[PDB]
Design a protein around this nucleic acid. Structure first.
Ligand code: MG
Lengths: 319, 187, 228, 228, 228
DNA sequence: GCAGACACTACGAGTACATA
DNA sequence: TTTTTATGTACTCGTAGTGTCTGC
């Protein structure tokens, strides 16, 4: 009951749901999409979520497939003002003899430069609402002008409730098992798939991409589990050194982050901010800013970073 | 008008689009715009009220936030703390520090500076442009001319410097249409 | 349905009134402006054998000129328009009926309040002088004995009292006066000899021009005095 | 080495394929698009007597248009291209041969799978219909035993199923079925009569337009189908 | 004053050299660039009856464009200026003479060190070639007994060694070898036949293009060598 | 033929970013 | 409730201006 595009070869594009029942939507979202398909007519919808891979384009194409709509797929960045005046009006004004509903799927239409192009679309809907319906998939909802959100039914993806999170994680684990049994990949440890789903949630496309990346040899053993669950590049070693006041560990690690100073500092501040007392928050931000301001003045950047580690480990009081 | 007394009562948008009147379509589509949402004043106020907020999807400007908060001395020790060391911090961390540090207060008002004029800023800008002196020396020149009494003669001399695109330098609001007549004939 | 060159020219003129047209079976093509400020009608040599609404008339006529004049126009099995040439078949889309503003019935013109005539040379001269002098509005009035047509400029003359052009059509015999004002962005005449009928009942009016090929009805502005 | 009007028109056409051309000595010029979606050669009358690579062919042809048709083109002592006129001498820069994406050898087209012929009038009207009906895709296929070019608009019809144009090329006596899709943005042929050879093998495919002077190999679209 | 078409075009050209211009009483008008790298003068047929300084010659000519040519321009009772033409009477401010930068003295060009002529078609070819080849400097020099303009691209050729254009102006018949480098941004002349007079002495020098309408005196670049 | 249609270019509005 | 830095740079889009080619 899985949908396979034999033409595609990217794993995250090969197994793309062709219907709403196949998706991993939350209970409320799946119920409302099923209701929309059962009603037979798609209203103006805006499927939006800052997290990529939640299912917006999949849901748009699946709706236009379920209701047998006369879908016209548009790259949103190509929906400039001439596109609204040109192909879009030609599409909406043409006659649908088959009775198929005309639906215009404007995928990834959150570009700001297309502000004017959206106004016309908002005017466009006021003149061709009966002829055609508009589905706008977007990531940054602030990029779609407010009148378009007022006219359209906005549906936010990628913020499921805790029960919905559990259910969709279970569904995604099941779907990844089906994908593995369909791709000729033997699953040695069943916890590896759960780890893949949990780490990359709610990005399902990244989940399938990581499944393809880690299934190089066709076996997902405890080594794959160690690779997935253990995130290289994190500051867990530095964080545990700071909490332990580990002088030797901080001294050894200081040259490891010497080259990538700015990003490491930003990540370090972002991570520590949530794990310290408010007064410790003020103090830590003060030290981080003061050290980062003298980044281009101090001679030894490695010793500079060691100084940063010393100060952070010293003046901090974990909650 | 409308020779046909039945019609179907098309709205503005249907008439504009169905007629392919792209001037009327542009006019009807311009009727949305809605330049609004005052993103800035709901950060500073939030900082003044320690209310939970997130700016990950928003646009944060450290200069405007610091200048706005500097109007209130109670928060300024924090601002100065970010005035020296916050240059390297990210916008997110800058906002986070200002959130954690700035004490709560019922503080509101208007920015402390010269309260515009559009009759005095233009004189200062014009004197600075004509005499090739800075804004401070332009203020000095205007203060001297007002006391001396030669200001109207100078304005009659350099009223020609006022032009179409010069007024936009003075201000961004749509009031320069009056300014063209303000010095239309100083005499 | 082979459309002659004269019919294509007439439809090209109609495309200046309305972008699209709902041409129905028979020898009658009507079209109207979407605001109803103007209307046309015409009887053509060719006979239309199928009902179809065209979203883009100018483009369709361009495609028609892009093939031979013998090209056979019909309706394809999918509902669109099929233009068959020696080897090339062109499939022009058929519009949704709701997206073209066309009149359901020809407007039944009542007994005309006045009847005059206008010559092709005078019509061309009027258009030429309007283009030259930026005359965006014309009007008809009765002086002491005759009927005259003049031009105004609503851009600069809000009262419509300064005359930039004038012309006399003929001698009018009667007892009622009128000053009928026509916006010049309505003169889609396709210049020729036109019998000019005018009707008005109250705070409303219409000016029909009957030609050898097509008739054009033009609405009059609200600020017109009927004096009937 | 003068460049005649025909050679200059040919090189102007080549400049729409590749921004610059590595033209070598002889009477033969070939070019390939930077992305390799359209290759072209031509056996031209004006003999070229020096290897030179032009990084900006359109600018070079514009400079040639500035001076008369009698301008003598040669290789300057510096190394550039010296266009000599009655009173003016222009030194167009010569590019490094490796900065101009050009073929190393003229690609040898295989034995054609299906051979047909498109006349100058048919190609011209196909291009004009493409401008009119806004079709950006064609598909050369078999219909009722005849090879037809179907013009689809890919923007509104992604699946290439609503035929907007259909031009019959000639009889097809073979027993294979194919649908070779060609982007109309890849049809950079100058007007003329073209013998249309089409070759396909699995995922490989091309369409050669053999002209009287210039031959244009065009890459088929990824969703082409055949059974060769 | 009345400003004919020719004088209006001349003033539009002068507006590129300087933003404004003091029109002094008489039939002679002149202007210079703000920095003083170029100067222009003309003997126009129209007669100016009052001194006036325009801070925005572009705006003044834009106002004059939409109004009829025969419009009368005079000074207002309150010190501004007024342009009156039948239906229109538009007032334009007159700035202080000391506000706008003008030479305040017609520069007397000394006896030329070398006199040649450049034809209108030759000058136009030089300008279009300069656009096409990205030529930004020219150098009027003596080559093999003729006087030639060599166009170099100073950006890619700091020392002006790689010649990109070469236009022969005519036989020299002198005894002094020079190389007068003129920036192409200083050449603001309108198309026409020009007598080119190059004067030099020590480290000072200039090049005067004397046309049938206006004379443009441009300044040579820094590294212009000569022996006058 | 030449008005009309198409292509190239410059400018303004808007956005985003870095820096002080 | 609560006004909006200055400078420099890069990109995109929409439109108006200009130049050139041309088809019933
Ligand atoms: Mg998407």
């Amino acid at each position: 009951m899985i949908t396979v595009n034999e033409k595609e070869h990217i794993l995250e594009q090969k197994y793309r749901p062709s219907t709403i029942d196949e998706c991993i939507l939350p209970a409320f979202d799946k119920e409302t999409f099923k209701s929309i398909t059962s009603k037979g007519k798609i209203p103006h919808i805006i499927l939006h979520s800052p997290s990529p891979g939640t299912g917006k384009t999949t849901v748009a194409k699946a709706l236009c497939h379920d209701v047998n709509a006369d879908m016209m797929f548009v790259n949103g960045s190509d929906c400039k003002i001439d596109f609204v005046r040109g192909p879009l009006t030609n599409f909406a004004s043409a006659a649908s003899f088959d009775g198929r509903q005309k639906v215009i799927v404007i995928d990834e239409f959150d570009r700001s430069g297309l502000a004017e192009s959206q106004r016309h679309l908002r005017s466009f809907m006021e003149a061709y609402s009966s002829n055609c319906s508009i589905i706008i998939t977007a990531n940054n909802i602030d990029g779609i002008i407010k009148p378009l959100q007022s006219r359209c039914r906005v549906i936010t993806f990628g913020q499921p409730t805790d029960e919905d999170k559990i259910e969709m994680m279970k569904q995604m684990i099941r779907r990844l098992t089906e994908i593995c049994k369909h791709e000729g990949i033997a699953i040695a440890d069943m916890k590896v798939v759960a780890a893949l789903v949990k780490k990359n949630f709610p990005d399902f496309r990244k989940t399938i991409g990581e499944l393809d990346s880690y299934s190089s040899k066709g076996v997902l053993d405890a080594g794959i589990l160690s690779l997935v669950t253990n995130d290289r590049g994190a500051i867990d070693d530095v964080l545990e050194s700071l909490k332990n006041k580990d002088v030797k560990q901080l001294r050894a690690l200081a040259p490891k982050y010497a080259a990538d100073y700015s990003w490491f500092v930003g990540k370090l501040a972002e991570e520590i901010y949530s794990r310290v007392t408010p007064q410790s928050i003020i103090r830590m931000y003060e030290i981080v800013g003061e050290n980062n301001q003298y980044h281009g003045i101090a001679a030894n950047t490695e010793l500079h970073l060691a100084y940063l580690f010393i100060q952070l480990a010293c003046e901090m009081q974990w909650k | 008008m409308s020779l046909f007394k039945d019609d179907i009562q098309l709205n503005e948008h249907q008439v504009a689009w169905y007629s392919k009147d792209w001037t009327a379509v542009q006019s009807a589509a311009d009727s949305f715009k809605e330049k609004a949402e005052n993103e800035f004043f709901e950060i500073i106020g939030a900082i003044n009220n320690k209310t939970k907020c997130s700016i990950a999807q928003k646009d944060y400007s450290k200069f405007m936030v610091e200048n706005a908060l500097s109007q209130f001395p109670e928060c300024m020790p924090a601002v100065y703390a970010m005035n020296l060391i916050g240059s390297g911090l990210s916008d997110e961390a800058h906002f986070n520090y200002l959130m954690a540090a700035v004490p709560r207060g019922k503080r509101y008002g208007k920015w402390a500076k010269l309260v515009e004029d559009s009759t005095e800023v233009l004189i200062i800008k014009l004197l600075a442009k004509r005499y090739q002196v800075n804004t401070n020396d332009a203020i000095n020149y205007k203060s001297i001319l007002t006391k001396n009494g030669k200001l109207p003669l100078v304005l009659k001399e350099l009223k020609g410097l006022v032009t179409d695109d010069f007024l936009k330098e003075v201000t961004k609001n749509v009031k320069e249409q009056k300014q063209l007549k303000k010095l239309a004939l100083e005499w | 349905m082979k459309l002659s060159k004269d019919t294509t020219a007439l439809l090209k003129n109609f495309a200046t009134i309305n972008s699209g047209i709902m041409l129905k079976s028979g020898q009658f093509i009507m079209t109207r402006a979407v605001n109803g400020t103007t209307y046309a009608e015409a009887n053509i040599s060719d006979v239309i054998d199928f009902d179809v609404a065209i979203y883009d008339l100018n483009g369709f006529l361009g495609i028609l000129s892009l093939v031979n004049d013998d090209a056979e126009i019909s309706q394809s099995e999918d509902g669109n328009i099929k233009i068959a040439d020696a080897r090339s078949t062109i499939f022009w889309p058929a519009a949704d009926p709701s997206t073209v503003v066309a009149p359901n019935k020809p407007i039944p013109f009542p007994v005309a309040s006045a009847v005059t005539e206008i010559k092709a040379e005078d019509l061309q001269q009027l258009l030429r002088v309007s283009r030259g002098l930026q005359i965006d509005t014309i009007a008809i009035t009765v002086k002491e004995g005759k009927i005259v047509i003049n031009g105004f400029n609503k851009v600069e003359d809000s009262a419509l009292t300064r005359v930039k052009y004038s012309l006399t059509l003929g001698d009018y015999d009667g007892e009622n006066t009128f000053n009928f004002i026509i916006n010049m962005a309505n003169m889609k005449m396709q210049p020729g000899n036109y019998k000019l009928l005018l009707w008005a009942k109250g705070k409303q009016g219409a000016a029909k021009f009957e030609g050898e090929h097509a008739n054009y009805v033009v609405a009059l502005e609200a600020d017109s005095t009927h004096d009937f």
